[PDB]
Design a protein around this ligand. Structure first.
Ligand SMILES: [Mg+2]
Ligand SMILES: [Zn+2]
Ligand SMILES: [Zn+2]
Lengths: 97, 76, 54, 97, 390, 65, 48, 449, 194, 75
RNA sequence: GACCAGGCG
């Protein structure tokens, strides 16, 4: 071996392989933005658990009602509807939360 | 359906453009001592590409001389 | 009076004719390729081919 | 008012882009071209090229150390595996060639 | 030598020349004769030389002139530059330029990204600033938020309050009370909160419990004091004449405003020009737009290449794009359209219709392998056989 | 690999005076005076000795038979 | 260091240099073709 | 130029026709000398490039003189058929005959040529006016009178003799050449090819042996120029803080276009651009024509004045998409500046030259500015090629019939006469259908002599 | 060949030693570069490096050029002036053919240069006849397997624009796949030969 | 105001029957070869021409001072 | 033969 060799690569079937670094997005942060095609104030997050990536977005529109988008759920169910699915049905609970 | 569409389909891939037989490719270098309508050709390429010719009464001598040189001397 | 397309077509036709057995109408130095013979014939003004124009 | 002190401004450059001497006197595209082109020159790559089995390889017969160089290249070990030679260059317009 | 002699000589020796050449020759001959004395022989020789030079400059029949024009338009675009200053000055209107503009023009976009108009003024109001300003006030459409100094919501009381800068409200032609006067006849019954500077927007839906801003924005976005579409107005001076630039296009309504010169008013929208003035104006508009856009970038392209494209685009009496849903979609040959885009759809449509391809084009003959009819493949020649070496 | 026999530009033989220069410059002498003493006047020759690497000694460890 | 975006699209915002790249990404070493901007190299002071 | 090729690694393909018809078509229709004039704008495309202009300027400048051996050697090298040297022009010490550059250059022009115009080297227009007046009053002036009033800014050829002016890009350069354009339209392609070959080889010989080089001392300004540049930059930077503070305390009438901030940005940018131009003016003034870089730039051979003023003066403001640098941390581009800063040097301005070096912040700003050119050259070509593909696929089948009309394959008439006068743009006189004044002048000169 | 300042090129001509010019101090150039390439690229660092390299070779010690901390230019120029040469870096040379000195002083120095691995011996290629694709019976692809060049669509458009129809017929059909097919005239289908 | 006053509009004119026949014979074409114009166009609306007639257009151009373009009215 | 990755103009 050459002493100048720094190392850090694999040997697969007699060939030398190196793994590059992917510049992904933050794994759990919340990012807000705004598009001009509507007045939507979209805030989207990526959620990671055991290698599974899920995209969740909550936003408003011209109606002024908050809507939520969930994977495998095509329709944007309203915000209060999805909040009451998790409990805390009383109207005080939502505002307190 | 995929064989007929795209940049590698049967229309834009083979019918409109196709690979040709007599061609060559190499790097270029400047040469200001030749006239504008001439080009320099390496002797390696000139001995590979061929131009068919029909023997007549005004070029029989040159053709017969060329044939004798075989495929390894330059004029041949 | 010939358009350059007509001139090129006539020269090509005569050059093809010469290389198949047609006799040359003018004396030519030996070793000349048939295309050059056709060109010489054209500039000497002895080409017999004519073009029909609508 | 200050809260921190920069260690060495010359180290913000990458590894190949640090080879160019006097890099602040050139246009940016030329520096980019030089940095990219520094990864293709011929020279003594590794000491064990004789035993090493590779599909392709190159070797320069008489490599030399640059006369004008940055102090980073000495530290990173580039001087022990150089690539390139020093020429006596005259800026003159010759006969077209 | 008299001028009538020159005129008669021109009219009898160069009668085949175009009119512009025939006039330029007379002008230049007069100019040169008024300072050097000229004899008749020189005039005759000059006319002969001009005639010969024009004769030798004609186009050879069979020339592939469409491909040359297409290449001469496409190739310079690869060296296009962009500046995009984005200056806040009203004098410099933010308008898209360069390759995107060429793409918009050629593709025949239904509505441009930055619509704009050039409005000239009549003999009156032409050389004055205040009259131009008030004319521009007439053109410009004004909504409530434009004149408003500032606004404030009252979600607690479910009402809206508007405050307006007097310098705009009093100069806007209409006044504070006229807004309520018009709103009494339009929309719904307003709250009639006329208090000069202070205006209260409390629509009927904006009751004490809910439904605020359901109509408050609609009242605030009421169309008054100017034409629709136009959202800005700018006054400029170019030499001895004032001109007006605007944002948005309302050509049909704009041509009706008093004091606006209609003989020179134009817009950058092609379809509107076609609908108002016909196809022959759209052709000239396309030519002028392309020429100006190409010239502003420093390049140089001959007019004869642009004329062919302009004529081809308007062959059916309506402006249509150059592409999949335009000129290329009107070709009779099935293979010529199929080789371009969406091959399978075209093939199945032709199979259904029982279409017939006559192989009268260029691409199809290339596909088959038989000679094309474009250039050399057009001529035909004959030979007299009994020839002997002279 | 090893010191070139002759200077590239002018052909002067300098291949036999590298070790003396290296030793005398490692002994603390002034490099300019050493080069002047060795007789190398034109800088085209000084460039050869001043910028050489002895890469032969660390590649003999690998033998190919 | 490589980005997961698609190469063909322009991506005007992604290919531009950023102020936060100072000391973390080399500002001059990048490919020349369509890969420009989307492939970058770590600086010398960078520490993961 | 027509190939757009450069010798830095380029490659090209070569094809060989096989049938006699193909050879005849290539020989008659595709010859190089048949495509000197570009069909896009009716001007020369093949011509001199780089050294072919600098050598011509060195040969035909004022005060150039050559000995016997140089003249004989250059004439033999160019290939000119000559068997007797002309009369010497002036005698050096010890009676050595000397020939001028114009006399040597005149041996390549045809015998009956005559033309005059003004080239790029025009600095004082009050001296060309006298020459134009002299030409106007008497159509064939006495050569001594013209030689007494010679000037490098006014080219004048009389009966094949170069009487005044100097070679420039307007002589035989691409898209500007005048002599080449006249030659190709009055004598034929073959004469143009012969002239091109001879002039190129002669200029190459001239530049090879006289010596031509550039060095580091070509951007050395005197102290007073640096002081003036420093004062200009100082006042330009000072008159921006006042605008910033004015905006900070209201007291600023916004332009009607956008909000106050955009007007402030536009004013700052205008001030900075004017500052850069003013600073470049003095750098242009203090560098004479003796410098080789100025010779190489002012004759159109290579480069432009912007490169000179960037190398010998401040680089100037950098920008992306027409606006100042704003990407970075919240309120500041770099971590080394206080948040919420709108100063000139805190958002892109560079007050240094390439010779004097750049500070690290200016280096980062320069790289940020320079990335835009690379990304634009990477991005534009795709849509440019797509548009060209659509255009070439739409307008392919239009021929020109024997009647002069352009017809679609089905038979629909598109134009009743190609263009509007039936004139080929390639054969036109720079777009014009025919150049009347040139014909009038040449005929009058031919007869009145 | 290419330096590290972004200047690249190819060898144009190889010259015998006796034809090259020589400086009056006894130096013969090892390389010649055109002065037209300097102003457009604005690579002043190359000139700085040339001066620094000549100074370093004269002094017998290497020169530091580490970014913003390296030795300033004026110091190098003053040192070069001290060593006996001219501060501008110019010298006087004699023409290698005629034998007399040129009219202008010539910049000359020492510059580091690199040899890239894009050699011409790996790019030359020529084909007359060879293997063909099985499916379409057209020439193969690649230098490694005796392939042929591709005649793309814009080449066809260029040939059309020139107007050479017979050239198109020769290039696109004669030098590529070509065959004879029996066609039934009555019904239009392709006939069968036994 | 008439649209013919606008600088972007060249004057139109309706051809008589004999002129139509002469033009049709001169170029050896049928009536389907000419460029078309819609019957609801403002210019033909001002002219008041029915479908089937041919309109002559006098155009002022930079290359040639005057040049004639012909169109056929189609509904 | 088709894919993937990296380079050249
Ligand atoms: Mg190149
Ligand atoms: Zn030596
Ligand atoms: Zn059958």
């Amino acid at each position: 071996e050459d002493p100048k060799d720094p190392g850090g690569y694999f040997i697969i079937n007699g060939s030398e392989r190196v793994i590059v670094s992917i510049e992904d997005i933050a794994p759990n942060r919340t990012l807000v933005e705004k598009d001009e095609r509507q007045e939507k104030y979209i805030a989207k997050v990526f959620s990671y658990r055991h290698g599974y990536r899920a995209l969740v977005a909550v936003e408003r529109r011209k109606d002024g009602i908050l809507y939520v988008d969930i994977p495998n759920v095509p329709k944007p169910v309203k915000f209060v509807y999805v909040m009451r699915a998790l409990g805390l049905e009383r109207d005080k609970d939502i505002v307190e939360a | 359906a995929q064989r007929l569409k795209g940049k590698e389909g049967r229309f834009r891939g083979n019918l409109s453009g196709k690979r040709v037989n007599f061609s060559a490719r190499t790097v270029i270098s400047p040469d200001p001592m030749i006239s504008i309508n001439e080009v320099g050709v390496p002797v390696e390429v000139a001995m590979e590409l061929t131009v068919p010719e029909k023997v007549t009464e005004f070029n029989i001598e040159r053709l017969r001389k060329m044939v004798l040189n075989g495929p390894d001397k330059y004029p041949g | 009076k010939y358009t350059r397309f007509e001139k090129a077509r006539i020269i090509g036709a005569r050059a093809l004719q010469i290389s198949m057995g047609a006799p040359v109408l003018i004396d030519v130095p030996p070793g000349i390729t048939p295309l050059e013979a056709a060109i010489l014939e054209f500039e000497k003004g002895v080409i017999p081919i004519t073009v029909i124009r609508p | 008012e200050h809260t921190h002190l920069e260690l060495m401004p010359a180290a913000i450059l990458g590894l190949p882009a640090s080879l160019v001497p006097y890099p602040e006197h050139n246009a940016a595209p030329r520096n980019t071209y030089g940095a990219g082109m520094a990864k293709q020159s011929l020279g003594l790559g590794w000491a064990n090229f004789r035993i090493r089995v590779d599909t392709r390889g190159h070797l320069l017969h008489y490599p030399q150390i640059p006369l004008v160089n940055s102090r980073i290249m000495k530290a990173v070990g580039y001087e022990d595996r150089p690539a390139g030679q020093n020429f006596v260059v005259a800026v003159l317009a010759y006969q077209g060639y | 030598v008299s001028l009538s002699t020159i005129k008669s000589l021109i009219e009898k020796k160069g009668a085949n020349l175009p009119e512009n050449v025939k006039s330029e020759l007379y002008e230049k001959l007069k100019k040169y004769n008024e300072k050097y004395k000229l004899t008749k022989a020189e005039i005759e020789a000059i006319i002969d030389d001009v005639v010969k030079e024009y004769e030798r400059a004609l186009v050879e029949p069979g020339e592939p002139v469409g491909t040359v024009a297409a290449q001469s338009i496409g190739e310079p675009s690869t060296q296009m530059t962009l500046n995009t200053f984005h200056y806040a000055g009203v004098a410099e209107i933010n308008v898209t330029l360069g390759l995107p503009r060429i793409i918009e023009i050629v593709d025949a976009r239904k509505n441009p990204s930055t619509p704009m108009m050039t409005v000239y003024l009549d003999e009156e109001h032409r050389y004055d600033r205040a009259k131009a300003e008030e004319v521009a006030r007439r053109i410009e459409g004004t909504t409530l938020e434009n004149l408003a100094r500032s606004t404030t919501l009252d979600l607690i009381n479910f009402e809206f309050i508007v405050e307006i800068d007097p310098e705009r409200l009093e100069r806007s032609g209409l006044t504070m009370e006229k807004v309520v006067k018009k709103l009494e006849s339009s929309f719904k019954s307003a709250e009639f909160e006329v208090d000069g500077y202070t205006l209260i927007v409390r629509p009927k839906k904006a009751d004490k419990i809910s439904d605020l801003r359901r109509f408050a924005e609609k009242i605030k976005k009421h169309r008054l004091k100017g034409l629709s579409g136009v959202g800005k107005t700018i006054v400029r001076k170019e030499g001895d004449e004032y001109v007006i630039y605007t944002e948005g296009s309302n050509f049909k309504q704009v041509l009706k405003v008093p004091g606006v010169d209609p003989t020179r008013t134009r817009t950058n929208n092609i379809h509107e020009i076609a609908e108002v003035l016909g196809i022959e104006a759209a052709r000239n508009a396309i030519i002028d737009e392309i020429v100006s856009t190409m010239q502003e970038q420093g390049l140089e392209v001959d007019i004869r290449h642009i004329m062919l494209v302009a004529d081809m685009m308007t062959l059916d009496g309506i402006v249509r794009p150059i592409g999949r849903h335009g000129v290329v979609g009107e070709k009779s040959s099935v293979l010529a359209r199929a080789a371009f885009e969406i091959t399978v759809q075209h093939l199945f449509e032709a199979a259904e219709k029982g279409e017939v391809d006559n192989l009268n084009g260029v691409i199809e003959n290339v596909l088959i392998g038989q000679p094309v009819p474009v250039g050399t493949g057009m001529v035909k020649l004959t030979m007299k056989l009994p020839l002997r070496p002279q | 690999m090893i010191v070139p026999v002759r200077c590239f530009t002018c052909g002067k033989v300098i291949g036999d005076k590298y070790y003396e220069f290296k030793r005398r410059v490692e002994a603390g002498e002034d490099p300019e005076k050493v080069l002047d003493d060795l007789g190398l006047e034109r800088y085209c020759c000084r460039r050869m000795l001043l910028s050489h690497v002895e890469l032969i000694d660390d590649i003999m460890h690998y033998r190919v038979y | 260091v490589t980005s997961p975006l698609d190469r063909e699209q322009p991506h005007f915002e992604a290919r531009d240099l950023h102020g936060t790249h100072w000391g973390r990404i080399c500002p001059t070493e990048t490919p020349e073709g369509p890969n420009c901007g989307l492939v970058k190299n770590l600086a010398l002071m960078a520490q993961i | 130029p027509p190939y757009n090729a450069d010798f830095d690694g380029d490659e090209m393909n070569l094809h060989v026709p096989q049938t006699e018809e193909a050879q005849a078509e290539a020989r008659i229709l595709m010859e190089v000398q048949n495509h000197i004039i570009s069909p896009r704008y009716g001007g020369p495309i093949i011509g001199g490039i780089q050294d072919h202009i600098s050598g011509g300027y060195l040969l035909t400048r004022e005060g150039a003189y050559f000995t016997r051996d140089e003249v004989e050697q250059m004439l033999m090298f160019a290939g000119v058929d000559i068997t007797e040297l002309p009369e010497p022009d002036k005698y050096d010490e010890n009676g050595n005959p000397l020939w001028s550059g114009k006399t040597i250059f005149s041996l390549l022009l045809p015998e009956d040529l005559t033309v005059w115009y003004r080239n790029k080297l025009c600095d004082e227009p009050e001296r060309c006016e006298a020459l134009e007046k002299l030409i106007e009053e008497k159509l064939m002036p006495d050569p001594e009178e013209v030689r007494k009033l010679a000037y490098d800014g006014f080219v004048y050829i009389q009966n094949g003799k170069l009487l005044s002016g100097a070679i420039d890009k307007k002589a035989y350069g691409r898209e500007d050449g005048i002599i080449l354009d006249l030659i190709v339209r009055e004598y034929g392609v073959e004469r143009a090819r012969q002239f091109l070959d001879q002039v190129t080889k002669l200029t190459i010989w001239v530049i090879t042996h006289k010596g031509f080089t550039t060095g580091i001392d070509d951007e050395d300004l005197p102290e007073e120029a640096r002081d003036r540049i420093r004062e200009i930059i100082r006042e330009a930077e000072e008159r921006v803080n006042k605008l910033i503070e004015a905006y900070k305390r209201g007291e600023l009438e916004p332009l009607p276009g956008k909000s106050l901030e955009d007007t402030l940005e536009s004013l700052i940018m205008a001030v900075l651009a004017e500052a850069r131009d003013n600073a470049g003016a003095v750098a242009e003034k203090y560098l004479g024509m003796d410098n080789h870089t100025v010779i190489m730039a002012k004759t159109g051979a290579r480069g432009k004045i912007l490169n000179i003023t960037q190398m010998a003066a401040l680089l100037g403001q950098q920008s992306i998409r027409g606006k100042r640098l704003y990407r970075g941390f919240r309120g500041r581009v770099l971590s080394h500046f206080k948040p919420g800063d709108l100063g000139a040097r805190a958002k892109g301005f560079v007050v240094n030259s390439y010779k004097s070096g750049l500070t690290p912040q200016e280096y980062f700003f320069h790289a940020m500015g320079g990335r835009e050119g690379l990304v634009d050259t990477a991005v534009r070509t795709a849509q440019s090629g797509y548009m060209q593909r659509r255009l070439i696929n739409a307008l392919q089948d239009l021929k020109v019939e024997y009647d002069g009309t352009v017809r679609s394959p089905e038979g629909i008439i598109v134009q009743f006469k190609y263009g509007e006068d039936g004139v080929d743009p390639m054969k036109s006189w720079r777009g014009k259908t025919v150049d009347v004044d040139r014909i009038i002048v040449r005929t009058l000169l031919k007869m009145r002599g | 060949f290419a330096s590290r300042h972004g200047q690249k090129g190819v060898i144009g001509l190889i010259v015998p030693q006796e034809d090259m010019p020589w400086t009056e101090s006894g130096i013969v150039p090892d390389l010649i570069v055109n002065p037209h390439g300097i102003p457009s690229r604005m690579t002043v660092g190359q000139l700085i490096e040339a001066i620094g390299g000549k100074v370093a070779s004269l002094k017998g010690r290497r020169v530091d050029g580490t970014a913003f901390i390296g030795e300033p230019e004026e110091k190098l120029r003053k040192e070069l002036e001290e060593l006996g040469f001219k501060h501008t870096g110019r010298e006087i040379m004699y023409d290698g053919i005629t034998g007399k000195r040129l009219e202008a002083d010539i910049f000359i120095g020492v510059i580091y240069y690199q040899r890239l691995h894009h050699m011409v011996a790996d790019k030359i290629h020529a084909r007359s006849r060879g293997p063909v694709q099985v499916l379409t019976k057209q020439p193969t692809e690649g230098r490694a397997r005796e392939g042929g060049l591709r005649f793309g669509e814009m080449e066809r458009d260029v040939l059309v624009g020139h107007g050479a129809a017979m050239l198109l017929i020769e290039r696109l059909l004669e030098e590529s796949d070509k065959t004879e097919v029996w066609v039934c005239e009555n019904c239009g289908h392709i006939a069968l030969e036994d | 105001f008439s649209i013919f006053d606008h600088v972007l509009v060249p004057e139109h004119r309706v051809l008589s029957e004999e002129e139509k026949k002469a033009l049709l014979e001169k170029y050896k074409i049928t009536l389907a070869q000419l460029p078309q114009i819609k019957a609801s166009d403002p210019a033909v609306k001002a002219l008041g021409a029915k479908p089937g007639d041919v309109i002559e257009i006098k155009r002022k151009s930079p290359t040639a001072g005057v040049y004639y373009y012909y169109r056929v009215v189609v509904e």
